[PDB]
Design a binder for these strands. Structure first.
Lengths: 236, 236
DNA sequence: TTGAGGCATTAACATTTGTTAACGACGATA
DNA sequence: TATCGTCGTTAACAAATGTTAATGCCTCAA
């Protein structure tokens, strides 16, 4: 929040300008692997990859402020071939060429730390997410992904906790959890309404049994407490 | 590695000696979170997590030299609760308090980017591993882990590529793939043997059909090609 | 008004994986 | 030499997930 607004100013001071993006457009993609260092400031995006046979996989979401690097800071090679798609109405981000980056952090080390610590928030997130998705199969993958969605995009209402996301199609959750067919997601979600943990009203998902998800995403809930405690407190 | 050898003699110059560890020993653990920065220099270690009901989860391995961290750098708080177990006969690492690390890298930048580099290796590795494990279920998870081990512990031989690892039980593969019962991994393996993909020799695993594994782990193969290209060329 | 396309839902059927038990091989110990 | 404990197989049955198809609800567009 503040540590990011500080880094915001450091960029405008050295000539980096904010570029604006709209929904369904990607800052970088897997087919034009050019190494940048994106600093999303305001908006929602998802990192994705498309298999050789056209299978989509949503790896995670990013809501500003956050850092996303498509290349290494030493060798300037690609960290991997991925796409960062804008899913919110409009998003703003400070793009940087990895060339200009190493020279930019060598001056101020408190912003070096800022970027370094977010990279740590990335690793802990990946291990936590990987941990819970592997133990309980797909049923837990859904609950794990849901758990993440209620912390980052959740507000409390009398009918539960509303996930304030414009689009949550069944195939979109399946892509986040690794399920290929929407009928399989629906079957699982048909059980979560049955067991009375979630309900679908007002074109949104409302969670009524947060603990049920914590049981299938314990390492993930642990991650919010340690990495995003403010987000954690809003539901605890 | 040259970058690591420069780092080794940078810490010894500041009074940081190397502790010795033996197999089965935990450098840190999920129950006594001391926020360290481990510069594992020689040896093999697995990062593990245990649930409240006692389910082991092998998240990944670490071949020295590398960098593991149990705490952030600014907040200096934990990044999650994991155990770093030594699995070789002996391993040599430099334990340093997380606060100590802050000032050393503040002086030397070439060593700072090296630490930043290794974390970029971590992120890309986690997403690639998550990508290939979440698409093709367990069969793709088992086939994915084998692809990782062959690129790190694999040596060419006439029979096939031996995976040099002592005590690689059916359990350790399951732990590393989310499978909780040895009968389930043996069944998957009973097929990969029937399909002329691997062999059991001298209580070891020889891989004969590398391309098969590459079908179920393209992002991981991609990662070794972009992140650890030296170790990649050995099998191409 | 009709009709097209997309998303949610369910069915059914096939395949995988979860789960337990029983068997046999290998080691180790007395 | 017999006996126990670990680990790899396979079997058998339950549960979960892959997969396809059909149906119904909703928007959109003419």
């Amino acid at each position: 929040n503040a540590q990011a607004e500080e880094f915001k100013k450091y960029l405008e001071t050295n000539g980096i300008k904010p570029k604006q993006f709209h929904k369904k457009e990607l800052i970088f993609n897997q087919w034009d692997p050019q190494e940048y260092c994106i600093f999303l400031y305001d908006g929602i995006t998802k990192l994705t990859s498309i298999s050789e046979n056209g299978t989509i996989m949503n790896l995670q979401y990013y809501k500003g402020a956050f850092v996303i690097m498509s290349g290494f800071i030493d060798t300037e090679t690609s960290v991997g071939y991925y796409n960062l798609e804008v899913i919110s109405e409009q998003a703003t981000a400070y793009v940087i060429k990895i060339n200009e980056l190493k020279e930019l952090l060598s001056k101020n080390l408190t912003h070096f730390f800022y970027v370094f610590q977010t990279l740590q928030k990335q690793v802990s997130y990946s291990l936590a997410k990987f941990n819970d998705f592997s133990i309980n199969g797909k049923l837990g993958s859904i609950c794990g992904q849901l758990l993440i969605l209620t912390y980052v995009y959740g507000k409390e209402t009398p009918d539960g906790i509303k996930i304030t996301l414009d689009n949550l199609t069944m195939q979109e959750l399946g892509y986040s959890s690794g399920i290929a067919h929407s009928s399989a997601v629906s079957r699982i979600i048909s059980k979560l309404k049955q067991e009375k943990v979630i309900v679908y009203k007002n074109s949104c998902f409302y969670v009524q049994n947060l603990d049920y998800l914590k049981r299938y995403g314990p390492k993930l809930d642990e991650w919010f407490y340690l990495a995003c405690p403010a987000t954690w407190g809003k539901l605890n």
